[model samples]
Structure formats: structure tokens, C-alpha cells
Target: FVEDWDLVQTLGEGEVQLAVNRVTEEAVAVKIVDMNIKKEICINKMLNHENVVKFYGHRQYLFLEYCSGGELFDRIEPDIGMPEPDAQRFFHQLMAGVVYLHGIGITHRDIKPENLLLDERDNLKISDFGLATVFRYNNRERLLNKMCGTLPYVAPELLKRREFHAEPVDVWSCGIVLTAMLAGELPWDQPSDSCQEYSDWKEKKTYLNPWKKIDSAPLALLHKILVENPSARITIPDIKKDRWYNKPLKK
Candidate 1:
């Protein structure tokens, strides 16, 4: 069931708009797309969760719950990062959403701050599904190849330009997300041998931007998630059980 929306305001560039659904009278975020819109509709339609931005699909118009707080990327400060408590809350919500997604066999493929929208309550609402795919029925696997995602968040294994496991790729992206949340900026522009920072991180150079900045527990978990061997990457179940994931940010 789709109804006309009163386009309210621009939220990002010229593509997404803030709108009011005429039928429900609810404020919404409308993203209009032409090509590959079905990919989003098919994947996002099934999601109904607190941390995932609510999705309503119709034609080229993708309606989401209007999140007024701004992109999570914008909430973070450069060089200093967000307060650990805020980051912790966001991270927990993010992981909750990711776990739900993966539990159903969907891989986001691109998990970055740019795709993380925050609502008025400052809770995480994961947006965008165009880059997502079903990798399994939570059992049978299909390796991924598109190599989609922003530079810093792209898993190092993806840059190798070969078929890679989708779950591990997402795990790696989450590691990058946590690092950026704590370190204030991406430790490297991209994860590859050519990027010195990525190489340094590979070598466990603890004196680098993120390694130097991340807390002991967070760093420990990150090392597990960001490992080059995708097969060995930390699983979501393990992430939920990890010390850093459960730790309360001190007041």
C-alpha cells in the first residue's frame, strides 16, 4: 500500500528527501532510485527491527523512518571521537541490527557510518540496502564479488578481487566502524598493502592512529575481526559475547 508523500526537505545531496506519508501522516525519509531498486526492496522489505531503519518499498520510491538526528558519521568528532558511552550504545545497536540481518542470511556488503542514520533519540537506524545480498539460508553459502563499499570500510580480502565470503567481509567492516567510532577518523583510507596504515595495522603496529587510540578491550576484539584470513574472522555470536561488546562505558 503506497500513497503520495509530501516532500518535506532535502536530507542528502539531491537524492533522498524528508517526506510526510499522506496516508499514515508520519514523517519519513524517501529515497528515490531508478536502477537496481528491486535489490533494496527484496532485501529490505523483510526487515522489521528497532535498530534497522524501517523500510517501506514501492516502485522507485523507498520510504524509511525519518531519522532527524543526522548521519552517525556527522555525530562523530574528528581526532577525538565520540564519548565511549555514546559509541558503546551506538555500537551495541549496530551490532544488534547486523546480527539480525546476518541471522537471516543477508549481508549488507557495505556497512559504513555514511549508511548509519541516527534518530531523534540518538539510536542507530541502519539505512540503505542496495548493496546488500543474500549469501545463504543461514547455512548454504554464496561467495560475494561486487567489491562494493567505501574505502576505509572495505574488507581487505575484497580488494584482492576474488570471490570472498560475505559474512567475514561484514565482520571486517564492523571492525572498521568500531575503530572509526573510537579513533575519530579512519585509520587508513583503505585496507590494502599500498596503504601504509593498513600495512602497519597488519603488522600490529600498536603506535598507529587507531591502535594507539583504541582502548585495550576494543583493540583486542578488533584484532580478531580485522584479520586478513576471512575464515578466521570473528563471528557475530562471538562479537556479542566479547568483553568489549558487553563493557559499559564509564561515567
Candidate 2:
């Protein structure tokens, strides 16, 4: 089984994306991680819903559903952003995915745009389980000190070294992604060369520019998700009632 899998094309590379390959004559993403890491991803895959990438059987390499539309981050452009209705639709679908993950007691520690893969129809499927963890519903376990996730999408509570909730941290990343879908620019993204300067800006919440291309409802949703306190921050249920989603239709 060691030499059975052959790399057709490179999909990506990093700690999370290392050895990611596209299979020959198939629309599948094959990633080659160690057996231990493979088991963890398999556990997370058991919790998959429609919006999550489907897990195919693993051979010498781990196989996943191949996303044709590429990364969601690549689709949005600052000069030509998605329409409000389209953004709303995307959010609705995304929430459905998150709801399913929560139901299975799995927390996707990394939920940024890069982790979100799109299909030919532009539908989203949450990917990248390298940082994900499974927890018991009855227990109150805190995952401290495994510094994970993309910096800009990290929850504020995590930045403060506070005991944070996992689901809401993903929710916060979802918020940043949602905003990017609507506005075409990351709210927390700053153009600074120095890490210290960027850190200082994020601490002050100065990096998030609310008054950009987005409308009122999307802006409000961003505020709800960006709160510094994880306990009081937005939840999946709260997002269901958001103005952008709950607005009255003209019919």
C-alpha cells in the first residue's frame, strides 16, 4: 500500500495542505498525512454533512471530494464584490454546514476562506480538518495553547489568552468570511510590514474597517461575531435571526 498512490497534481502545500494531490481521471483531492493524523481526520469526517467535503475511502493516501471552483477566498474581488442576495444565500448554506458539525460535537478550529472549497456550482464545502477537534457534549474542556488557525480570522478572546469556546471561534471566522463575501476585503486585514505593528492594530480592533462597501445588515452581523468576549459572542442560533437572513421578502 505504500507505493500504490501516485500524485497527479499538486493541490496545495503547508502543514495543513502538505502532499495534497489531485488524482488522475478523478475529481478527488488526495492528501498524504501520517497514519495518526489520518485517523483524526477520519474521525472528523464521520461528522460530515452536505456542505462538508465528502470523505472517500483511504488507501495509501487520504482521499476527499475534489473541489473544482477552488478556494472561496479566490472567488471574491475587492473591485467586484458579490451581490447582497448572493452573499445571503451563501451564508444560509454555510450555517447549515456549521449546524451539522455542531450536532456531531466536532469543532473545526480553522474555518477561514482558505479552508472553504467551492464546487462547480459555487456551493461551499468546508475542508481542512488539521486543527479540528472532537469533544464530549457534557464536558467543558478547553483547548488551550495549540496556537492554531489563520491570524486574521482568529477570535479576539483567543488573542487575549482567554479560555475560549471552539464553535464560536469558528463562528467568528465565518463572520470574517461572510464579510469578505459581501465586501470583497478582509475587515481585519492590515497593510503593515511589521508583525508588532499588526499585533498592536489588532489589539485595538483598529484593523476592522466597518464602513467599507458593505450594507447595514452585513455590518451588524460582523459586529455580533467580532465581540471580544467569547461567552457573549454570536452563536449559530443568533445568526439565524440576523437581519440579512431574516429580512422580509417582497414576494
The numbered model that scores best in TM-score is: 1
**Cα distance off (Å), candidate 2, residue 93:** 1.7
| Per-residue C-alpha lDDT of model 2 across residues 62-156, encoded as one tens digit per residue | 67777888887787777555777767767777888888887777777788778888888989888867677765356655555455687777776
193-242 per-residue lDDT for model 1 (tens digits): 89888889888998877678888888899888889888888898888899
Cα-based lDDT at residue 120, candidate 2: 84
In model 1, pairs of residues that clash are none
Model 2, 145: alpha-carbon shift in Å?
Answer: 4.7
